[PDB]
């Protein structure tokens, strides 16, 4: 019961890293869409 | 002490599913804002 609970946590920790890395990419991806939004504004208005 | 630790993990796992589903929707939502950004560029520049 102990060991399996430690294995549950490894999984949780593993999935959490995945989450954090994806979020990092989402934030940069959002940085880029912001640039484009603001760029299109300059040309046009 | 064992049982409550297993209940903590159920919660954690539950909140983690919520997180992953929200992120899925955020990625598609970002796919859509990308389309619109690029579309507006074509018309204008």
């Amino acid at each position: 019961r102990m060991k399996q609970i430690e294995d549950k946590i490894e999984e949780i920790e593993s999935k959490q890293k995945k989450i954090e890395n994806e979020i990092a990419r989402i934030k940069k991806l959002l940085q880029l869409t912001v640039w484009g939004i603001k760029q299109l504004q300059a040309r046009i208005l | 002490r064992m049982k409550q630790i297993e209940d903590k993990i159920e919660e954690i796992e539950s909140k983690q599913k919520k997180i992953e589903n929200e992120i899925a929707r955020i990625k598609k939502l970002l796919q859509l804002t990308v389309w619109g950004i690029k579309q507006l560029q074509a018309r204008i520049l």
């Binding site: 880029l32 | 990625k27 970002l30």
Partner: peptide
């Protein structure tokens, strides 16, 4: 805008 576009598919 190419860097912008290269980066788009890059981080996605």
């Amino acid at each position: 805008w190419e860097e912008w576009d290269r980066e788009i598919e890059n981080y996605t």
